[PDB]
Design a protein around this motif. Structure first.
Motif, short mmCIF file in Angstrom:
data_model
loop_
_atom_site.label_atom_id
_atom_site.label_comp_id
_atom_site.label_asym_id
_atom_site.label_seq_id
_atom_site.Cartn_x
_atom_site.Cartn_y
_atom_site.Cartn_z
N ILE A 1 83.43 -22.96 85.15
CA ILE A 1 82.86 -23.67 83.87
C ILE A 1 83.63 -23.50 82.59
CG2 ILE A 1 81.01 -24.38 82.55
CD1 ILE A 1 79.36 -22.19 84.75
N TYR B 1 85.38 -26.31 80.12
CA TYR B 1 85.99 -28.07 79.24
C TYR B 1 87.93 -28.01 78.99
CZ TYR B 1 86.70 -25.57 75.08
OH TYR B 1 87.68 -24.06 73.91
N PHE C 1 76.40 -25.18 69.49
CA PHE C 1 75.80 -26.14 70.34
C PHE C 1 74.76 -25.53 71.40
CE2 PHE C 1 80.04 -26.69 71.40
CZ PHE C 1 80.26 -26.27 72.55
N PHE D 1 74.75 -31.63 80.42
CA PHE D 1 75.13 -31.66 81.61
C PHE D 1 74.38 -32.40 82.65
CE2 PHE D 1 78.48 -28.19 82.82
CZ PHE D 1 77.84 -26.78 81.28
N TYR E 1 74.38 -22.52 89.92
CA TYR E 1 74.95 -21.92 88.62
C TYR E 1 74.58 -20.42 89.26
CZ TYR E 1 75.62 -19.72 84.61
OH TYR E 1 76.28 -19.25 83.22
N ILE F 1 70.51 -27.23 91.10
CA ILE F 1 69.62 -29.08 91.40
C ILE F 1 69.81 -29.21 92.80
CG2 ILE F 1 70.15 -31.23 90.58
CD1 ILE F 1 71.57 -30.14 87.62
N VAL G 1 71.82 -26.76 78.77
CA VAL G 1 71.48 -25.82 78.77
C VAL G 1 71.68 -25.11 77.17
CG1 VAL G 1 73.10 -23.94 78.71
CG2 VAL G 1 72.69 -24.64 80.89
N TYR H 1 80.88 -19.94 68.98
CA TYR H 1 81.74 -19.91 70.91
C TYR H 1 82.53 -19.63 69.57
CZ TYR H 1 78.41 -21.92 74.16
OH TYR H 1 77.61 -21.99 74.88
N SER H 2 83.78 -19.27 70.73
CA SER H 2 85.69 -19.25 69.87
C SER H 2 86.23 -19.83 70.48
CB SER H 2 85.84 -17.71 69.67
OG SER H 2 85.49 -16.60 69.22
N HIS H 3 86.80 -21.28 69.96
CA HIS H 3 87.93 -22.04 70.66
C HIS H 3 89.29 -21.12 70.42
CE1 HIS H 3 85.27 -25.77 69.32
NE2 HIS H 3 84.90 -24.79 70.33
N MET I 1 89.13 -13.49 77.09
CA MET I 1 88.24 -12.45 76.24
C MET I 1 87.42 -12.42 77.41
SD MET I 1 86.22 -14.72 73.15
CE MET I 1 86.74 -16.65 73.50
N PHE J 1 81.94 -18.03 81.41
CA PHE J 1 80.32 -18.63 82.00
C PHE J 1 79.87 -18.67 82.90
CE2 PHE J 1 82.01 -20.50 78.02
CZ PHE J 1 81.15 -19.97 76.83
C1 LIG Z 1 71.96 -25.79 86.90
C2 LIG Z 1 73.24 -25.78 86.32
C3 LIG Z 1 72.95 -25.09 85.24
C4 LIG Z 1 74.86 -25.06 84.09
C5 LIG Z 1 74.69 -23.87 83.51
C6 LIG Z 1 76.11 -23.97 82.60
C7 LIG Z 1 75.43 -22.62 81.38
C8 LIG Z 1 76.79 -22.43 80.93
C9 LIG Z 1 77.57 -23.73 79.94
C10 LIG Z 1 78.38 -23.32 79.15
C11 LIG Z 1 78.96 -24.28 77.50
C12 LIG Z 1 80.51 -24.02 76.92
C13 LIG Z 1 81.09 -23.90 75.91
C14 LIG Z 1 82.66 -23.72 75.87
C15 LIG Z 1 82.36 -22.56 75.25
C16 LIG Z 1 83.63 -21.55 75.00
O1 LIG Z 1 84.69 -22.39 73.85
C17 LIG Z 1 83.95 -20.14 74.49
N1 LIG Z 1 85.30 -19.36 75.70
C18 LIG Z 1 82.80 -18.79 74.60
O2 LIG Z 1 83.69 -17.78 73.35
#
Ligand SMILES: CCCCCCCCCCCCC/C=C/[C@@H](O)[C@H](N)CO
Ligand SMILES: *C(=O)CCCCCCCCCCCCC
Lengths: 279, 266, 62, 235, 4, 213
Positions: free
Chosen positions: A87, A89, A107, A111, A136, A160, A173, A182-184, A210, A215
């Motif tokens: 996971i 972006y 935030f 999804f 997941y 799902i 989520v 979160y650290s970008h 890191m 995730f």
């Molecule tokens: C059934 C599907 C479930 C999906 C669950 C997804 C869980 C993870 C959500 C993560 C959102 C990520 C946003 C990004 C954070 C990063 O910028 C930083 N690396 C955190 O320090």
């Protein structure tokens, strides 16, 4: 009430107040308004910044992944009977660049999953409607080695089950970060080499990364057993940040991204040519 | 009447005082003065050490010279102070450390010299590497200590794919990280424009996504000094003048005491 | 548990405060929609982060 | 005909959803509860009970009753550690199968303080003083008592109170650590050294076992439920 | 309900 | 795709490597590419080779990791377990992680132990009839006992008694001897074939005889 300030009427000046002169050396922007340097009329201002709040700037589903998964007879070769996506972006560029106007963010994440399928072979009969499992797998949980091994029992991981042709699936989520935001950008390492280390590999780690698994991953499979004809599907994942707070603004990315860090490589020439005195 | 000016300042911390008679006011980054962790933001539970005047005092780094072909300099914090008196000792004896800073950059010249330095304080200043391999700058190269690093005018890719240098290659108009230098003004900054001032003073709160972190693994702030307008004097082609950087830790607190960390730098 | 708020009306029909209604159906706040009723702030921490902030009519360097 | 519009998510099945559904056996006469002893309300209650650590996973000892016994003796080399262990309570092989490690392996993140209690099983005539220590991460793992004593430590005097507890305080940069091994969220090192030595009179065993126990303190929590790697099923 |  | 060849003996003493090759097709190349190893093994839940950026030793102190890490490659990584005791099997696994589908791999395991050593000794003087001259085929140090086989040149072979296993440190030992009766010649290439199925071709030791007066 959210409108911007009204323009005040102002007339001529001959005085010792000089708002037009300043010293940008101090680090400050001169807060002038048109009535400081020209004669203005009164204008009752009705415009607002409703659409550039942090929430409205991010309030769009942006594509972050395209996962391909097949449903065909399990042969002995490498197949795509299930697929895993770490996971992030950072596999696409458009949402990455908008988030990176800021150093830290907090935030919840929505999804939405759009699933499309097609036949690949001219004909070996057909296929009955497919159901997809998107599981997941958080850092530490067992990952599947085959499309129907025991991990797909999903007793604790959330899954799902999506039916082809139904409205795109959607889940939210919470803020799941290990820190308070979160650290970008992370200017550091996960390990430090010490003088007493046996070799240099022990303290070596990637700059600005890191955790290793971050995730976790989404594991996708078609739940149906195979038909005689092969069916290929793609799952497109759209992320939308909601209930957004952001801190410490940054210059936006100006040259192409080259990996998950800030590295650059080509097209380091973003500005075009224009004569100094050409309008 | 008695004569206070935003050009003349005295800064006193611990046993050290700085005076300047040609300042351009001073910046408090993001409007936040440094402070200690509050109980309701606290996370490690052990009682912190707060060395106070022993570590929160001005340390002067080695002077660098600004010449006509200089492209710029960068330092990271707390790294530039890792070997400074009891601040460095507390940093290495403790797993966790937190600190804000006063940064004072000094550069005097004369009324016939000209040039302008941009002094930018950047939270999480990630810099770009020198090769095709991503995120590959090594710990020892990413952390130059008080020596700091330099900027370049162009991307020189390390090609010895055999014994890679694993260094940063910060290109100046891209702020060393893929953005345009002109937008660096969204970061807390001052300009030392030689006709106007001879110093820049910036107070930095601790900024991080955590209340306290490892100072050895992570740098919170980067200081980037770039010639926005190059040095020039009379009609001489090789004028050089010093730039000296003096930095003081502020509101230092440390948690997680044990034996000392000894990083391998060489 | 219905929240009723006013809409900011753009085009008006040839027909006043028009309201809309919201009910949260889930226990977890991450499930909620965005209310988009967002307040703003002062840019000063970025535009004027000076220890002595001076008035624009006065000289910046005194 | 109330007009309705179906949104994204319609007709999906999320296995962690929480919705109502029709009862298949309506009006069933349910058997009422009785008060059974031993009710549990939260899984963290189980992580707070001391369970014995398999401290000795050497070749011939692992998976035998001897994995629970650490030998102390009056002729041990006093400069060497008695045991060394990383603070990865769901991952280090000595901690991952304790009741604390088994509960954390169903969660992705953990946070809080932990306590290690050691029991001396020598005879009443044996005496000794032992240093047990915790080094927060980031420096060289202790190899000598001299380095171990610079971190958090307890000096245990053996005597009528048979056991000693060292508390490993929560000292972390992140607010929650990962239950897998990760250097970004690493927890530090536990080591144990002799402070003087085991001393016994004549006609007394010169070697004896020490047993160790671990449990969570009252500030400990876990989050993000996940499947464990500790059970599987073959086809 | 709660109007705002 | 997963193509691990590791079904390895595996030699004891030790020491040898425990490799893991994952050849990568070919136009949809793999990241993130961290590599995990899970033992098999009282796994609750660690004796692990994990490699995020810097190689992390999940605590089995007796390990060596050799992959071009902290950067990337990706993973045809080799592990090594020394040492030097028979911390055996059981089994071992090798699982990778991937941005595309590949948070997955395959379990793959095998052998360990233990080769023996041999020498021949022949005496003593012939006062007949009618046993030993005497050729002994000593077999020292091999827990899975080496199948010692005395043969020679003629039908004067059916006569082959064994010293069974009074085991040394973890490791079994034996001695086959002959006997072979009586009378004269030197002189024949009487060959003891000691196997165990390790090394190259089975230990073939040919000798002579003590002829007296
Ligand atoms: C059934 C599907 C479930 C999906 C669950 C997804 C869980 C993870 C959500 C993560 C959102 C990520 C946003 C990004 C954070 C990063 O910028 C930083 N690396 C955190 O320090
Ligand atoms: C505040 O909520 C007062 C009552 C509102 C009545 C209308 C409720 C509509 C149904 C909500 C169901 C939520 C899921 C069980």
């Amino acid at each position: 009430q959210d409108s911007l300030p009204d323009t005040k009427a102002s007339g001529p000046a001959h005085s010792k107040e000089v708002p037009a002169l300043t010293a940008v050396e101090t680090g400050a922007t001169n807060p002038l308004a048109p009535s400081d340097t020209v004669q203005t009329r009164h204008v009752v201002q009705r415009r607002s910044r409703s659409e550039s709040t942090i929430e409205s700037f991010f309030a769009r589903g942006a594509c972050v992944a395209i996962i391909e998964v097949d449903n065909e007879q399990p042969t002995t070769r490498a197949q795509k009977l299930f697929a895993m996506w770490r996971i992030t972006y950072k596999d696409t560029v458009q949402l990455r660049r908008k988030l990176e106007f800021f150093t830290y963010s907090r935030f919840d994440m929505e999804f939405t999953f759009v699933v499309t399928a097609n036949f690949t072979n001219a004909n070996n009969g057909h296929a009955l409607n497919q159901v997809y499992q998107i599981m997941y797998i958080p850092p530490g949980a067992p990952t599947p080695k085959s499309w129907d091994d025991y991990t797909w029992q999903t007793s604790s991981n959330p899954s799902i089950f999506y039916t082809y042709g139904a409205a795109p699936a959607r889940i939210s989520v919470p803020y799941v970060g290990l820190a308070n935001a979160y650290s970008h950008f992370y200017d550091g390492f996960a390990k430090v080499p010490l003088k007493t280390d046996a070799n240099d590999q022990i303290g070596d780690s990637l700059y600005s990364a890191m955790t290793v698994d971050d995730f976790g991953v989404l594991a996708v499979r078609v739940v149906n057993d195979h038909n005689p004809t092969k069916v290929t599907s793609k799952v497109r994942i759209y992320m939308k940040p909601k209930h957004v707070r952001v801190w410490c603004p940054r210059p936006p990315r100006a040259v192409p991204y080259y990996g998950p860090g800030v590295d650059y490589r080509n097209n380091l020439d973003p500005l075009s040519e224009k004569g100094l005195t050409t309008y | 009447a008695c004569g206070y000016s935003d050009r003349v300042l005295q800064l006193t911390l611990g046993n050290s005082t700085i005076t300047t008679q040609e300042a351009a006011n001073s910046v408090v980054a993001y409007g936040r003065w440094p402070e200690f962790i509050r109980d309701d933001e606290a996370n490690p539970v052990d009682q912190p050490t707060e060395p106070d005047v022993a570590t929160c005092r001005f340390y002067t780094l080695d002077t660098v010279m600004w010449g006509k072909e200089s492209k710029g300099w960068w330092w990271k914090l707390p790294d530039a102070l890792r070997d400074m008196g009891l601040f460095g000792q507390n940093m290495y004896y403790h797993y966790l450390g937190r600190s804000g800073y006063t940064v004072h950059v000094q550069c005097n010249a004369s009324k016939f010299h000209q040039g302008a330095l941009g002094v930018f304080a950047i939270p999480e200043y990630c810099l770009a590497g020198d090769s095709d391999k991503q995120r590959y700058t090594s710990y020892a190269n990413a952390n130059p200590g008080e020596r700091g690093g330099k900027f370049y005018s162009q991307f020189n890719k390390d090609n010895a794919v055999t014994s890679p240098k694993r260094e940063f290659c910060p290109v100046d108009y891209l702020l060393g990280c893929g953005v345009l230098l002109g937008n660096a003004f969204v970061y807390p900054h001052q300009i030392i424009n030689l006709r106007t001032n001879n110093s820049a003073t910036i107070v930095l709160p601790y900024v991080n996504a955590l209340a306290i972190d490892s100072m050895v693994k992570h740098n919170n702030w980067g200081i980037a000094i770039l010639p926005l307008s190059p040095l020039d004097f009379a009609q001489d082609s090789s004028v050089e003048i010093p730039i000296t950087v003096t930095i003081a830790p502020m509101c230092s607190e440390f948690n997680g005491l044990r034996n000392v960390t000894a990083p391998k730098f060489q | 548990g219905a929240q009723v708020s006013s809409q900011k009306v753009g085009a008006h029909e040839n027909s006043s405060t028009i309201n809309y209604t919201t009910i949260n159906y889930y226990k977890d706040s991450a499930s909620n929609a965005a209310s988009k009723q967002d307040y703003s702030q002062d840019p000063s921490k970025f535009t004027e982060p000076l220890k002595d902030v001076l008035i624009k009519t006065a000289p910046a360097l005194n | 005909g109330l007009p309705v519009l179906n949104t994204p998510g319609s007709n999906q099945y999320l296995t962690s959803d929480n919705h109502q559904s029709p009862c298949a056996i309506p009006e069933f006469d349910v058997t009422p509860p009785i008060d059974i002893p031993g009710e549990v309300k939260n899984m963290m209650e189980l992580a707070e009970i001391d369970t014995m650590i398999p401290l000795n996973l050497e070749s011939t000892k692992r998976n035998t009753m001897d994995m629970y016994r650490v030998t102390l003796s009056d002729s041990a080399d006093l400069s060497q550690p008695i045991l060394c262990l990383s603070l990865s309570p769901a991952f280090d092989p000595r901690l991952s199968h304790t009741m604390l490690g088994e509960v954390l392996n169903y969660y992705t993140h953990w946070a809080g303080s932990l306590k290690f209690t050691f029991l001396f099983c020598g005879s009443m005539m044996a005496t000794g003083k032992i240093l047990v220590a915790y080094a927060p991460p980031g420096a060289q793992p202790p190899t000598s008592r001299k380095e171990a004593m610079l971190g958090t430590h307890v000096i245990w005097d053996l005597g009528l109170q048979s056991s000693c507890t060292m508390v490993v305080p929560w000292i972390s940069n992140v607010t929650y650590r990962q239950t897998t091994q990760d250097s970004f969220t690493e927890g530090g090192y536990i080591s144990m050294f002799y402070q003087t030595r085991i001393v016994v009179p004549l006609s007394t065993p010169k070697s004896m076992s020490m047993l160790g126990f671990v449990s969570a303190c009252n500030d400990f929590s876990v989050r993000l439920l996940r499947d464990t790697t500790h059970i599987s099923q073959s086809a | 309900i709660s109007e705002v | 795709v997963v193509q691990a060849p590791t079904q390895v003996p595996g030699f004891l003493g030790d020491s040898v490597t425990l490799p893991c090759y994952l050849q990568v097709p070919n136009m949809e190349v793999t990241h993130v590419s961290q590599l995990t190893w899970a033992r098999h093994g009282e796994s609750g839940s660690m004796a692990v080779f994990h490699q995020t950026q810097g190689p992390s030793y999940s605590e089995s102190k007796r390990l060596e990791f050799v992959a071009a890490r902290l950067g990337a490659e990706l993973r045809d990584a080799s592990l090594r377990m020394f040492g030097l005791r028979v911390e055996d099997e059981g089994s071992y696994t090798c699982l990778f992680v991937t941005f595309p589908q590949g948070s997955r791999s395959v379990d793959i395991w095998l052998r360990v132990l233990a080769k023996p050593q041999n020498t021949a000794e022949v005496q003593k003087v012939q006062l007949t009839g009618e046993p030993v001259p005497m050729a002994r085929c000593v077999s020292t140090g091999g827990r899975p006992p080496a199948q010692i086989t005395w043969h020679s040149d003629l039908g004067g072979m059916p006569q082959t008694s064994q010293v069974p296993g009074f085991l040394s440190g973890t490791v079994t030992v034996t001695s086959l001897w002959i006997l072979v009766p009586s009378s004269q010649v030197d002189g024949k290439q009487v060959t003891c074939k000691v196997e165990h199925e390790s090394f190259e071709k089975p230990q073939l030791l040919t000798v002579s005889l003590t002829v007296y007066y």
